[PDB]
Write a protein that binds this ligand. Structure first.
Ligand SMILES: COc1cc(OC)nc(NC(=O)NS(=O)(=O)c2c(C(=O)O)cnn2C)n1
Lengths: 349, 349
């Protein structure tokens, strides 16, 4: 069912700072020539929208897109089925979705001059990076190579154009400033649950160590593992014996211990191999990355935590990609999120 | 006043093309290093969202943000009151809002290399332009100089930071490709009404000349005037006797004539001077720009059209800025839009 009843909805900007050009602004002089002269720029702010059901129950959910994405991935699937935003408003949660700084409706810090440069200061790099359709295909485990699908895939096949159109570049904004914006959002809304994805997995972990209002984390296929400083376990290279996964993020142990105080669940889809796969770099990357996360959750649990790893195939769901929340079975994926929230009372007032 | 009941909601991507890097993609090689080799890139696609009421009436509305903006400006005001999206779903219209190519969730075409460059080809310029807080303050007629308000202003004071944070740069995407994406949307949705703003004013006029499904246009303070080719009337410079307004866009008369076949209203706010104001460049710019538009509407009416200029002060609304649909009296502004829709039969099935 697609019907949704909202007590209220809206959007707002939060976070960011200002930077300034030289000189003074003269309102009698041509303004459209557009210079940095006397200019104030708001940079690195974050876009937030919310939908609140009638009679909400439990804590609000904050959905945080993965790398190169926007809040669109929580609104609808590529083939136009309801996303988690609709599903969880229907589940009587207030739902926030964000476009983080540097992505979508979040700020891209650029000015009058080469991209990212304000006179002689480099706010973000002029040289960009961006994934390709082919890179994203294998990153997301649609299949082992572009154009190919794993058997019993849950990808909405035929909607590849819609799917890859949602992805884009990110400028070199400091991860510190992205975490800061979401910490400010968590302060603004009160106790809440973070639901993260891929690149925003490690960032949401960082937010929780700065914000007691984060009462729970569910992370869909986080990309970067996190460990106490100096206590990164041995992690093997990839099957090509030269490549490695993302360098794990290290935080002071006093902050790492805060992750032991809240329920945390990492969710993984299908077709992550058990054994080395030299022929398919990103399948092997996911094998080792998932292994690193299992060690990260173990370290949290050794400090008193409540951290768990959910492989969707163990729960009877086969064929999920790196985006289980937009796959064809995303209602069943949502049902498992509801189960986690209910188990820990995060769906009660 | 905030409750909304939706039969369905969602978002999707539409329009755009692809460009390709050199070489071929090999899934056995490191994918994350990140390069253009073997790369297909989707570029210039547009983001679209929709909210459909239960029991819709009349034609769907397409809200099209002004320059440097996004669909946020139709969602909420900077002080958090409902935007036109909520107001017109409550008025039982299906409401589409877009982030055009190059803005917000629309695509920004950049790759692996200097911003906008795909190997040797410049897709968009590496040098950007962007307005400042100061330039936007006087552009939007909050007051005559940055930090100063007109006594009558309808701006939601105290929420300046929120307001200016919604603005950003646009890469040098061809206007043809922006018009193309919206023509494809209008083809997809069927008969509809365009509601435009500032920079999207001239673009919406162009869409209507390509798309018979556009059945009406309301433009809030369009920034660029439009005339039949070779029939641009005499337009004076600004009071400084050096500056000019935006060069009017010229189209073939066979296309311009299609503007005479639908109702068209341009809406202007307050504090546009009647006499030359050499001390306040953007106040004077709005005086001459509004004059040019009056001549543009006259040309449409001389081709049998029904094109009107609504000055909000003549309807009893004083103090409106360049964003009347987010001002403190935006409910009264919406009432005037509903009047236009009802008079022209655009709110009946
Ligand atoms: C349109 O709907 C909402 C919802 C919401 O919360 C669920 N907050 C706003 N705005 C809002 O709070 N602005 S604000 O006041 O300027 C502000 C502060 C502050 O000063 O207390 C801190 N952050 N910010 C953004 N709009």
């Amino acid at each position: 069912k697609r019907k949704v009843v909202l007590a209220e909805q809206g959007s707002f900007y939060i976070g960011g700072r200002t930077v300034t050009g030289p000189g003074k602004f003269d309102p009698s002089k041509p303004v459209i020539r557009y210079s940095n002269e006397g200019a104030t720029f708001y940079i690195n702010q974050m876009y937030v929208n919310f939908q609140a059901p009638v009679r909400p129950r439990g804590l609000p959910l904050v959905f945080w897109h993965g790398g190169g994405l926007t809040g669109h991935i929580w609104e609808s699937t590529p083939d136009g089925r309801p996303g988690f935003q609709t599903l969880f408003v229907q589940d009587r949660h207030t739902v926030y979705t964000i476009d983080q700084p540097g992505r979508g409706r979040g700020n891209i810090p650029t000015f009058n001059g080469p991209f990212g440069q304000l006179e002689e200061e480099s706010i973000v790099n002029t040289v960009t990076g961006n994934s390709s359709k082919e890179g994203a295909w294998v990153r997301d485990r649609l299949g082992p190579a572009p154009g190919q699908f794993f058997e019993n895939s849950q990808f909405p096949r035929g909607y590849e154009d819609n799917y890859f159109k949602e992805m884009g570049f990110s400028p070199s904004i400091s991860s510190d400033e992205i975490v800061d914006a979401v910490v400010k959002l968590v302060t603004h809304i009160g106790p809440c649950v973070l639901v993260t994805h891929s690149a925003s997995g490690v960032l949401g972990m960082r937010v929780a160590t700065h914000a007691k209002n984060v009462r729970g984390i569910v992370a869909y296929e986080p990309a970067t593992s996190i460990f106490p400083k100096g206590k990164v376990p041995e992690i093997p290279p990839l099957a090509d014996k030269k490549s490695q996964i993302f360098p794990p993020f290290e935080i002071q142990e006093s902050y790492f211990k805060k992750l032991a105080k809240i329920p945390i669940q990492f969710v993984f889809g299908d077709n992550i191999p058990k054994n080395p796969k030299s022929a398919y770099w990103f399948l092997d990357w996911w094998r080792v990355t998932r292994y690193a996360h299992s060690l990260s959750l173990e370290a949290i649990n050794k400090l008193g935590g409540q951290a768990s790893l959910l492989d969707l195939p163990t729960a009877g769901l086969r064929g999920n990609t790196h985006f289980p929340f937009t796959d064809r079975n995303n209602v069943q994926v949502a049902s498992l999120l509801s189960d986690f929230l209910g188990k820990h009372g995060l769906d009660q007032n």
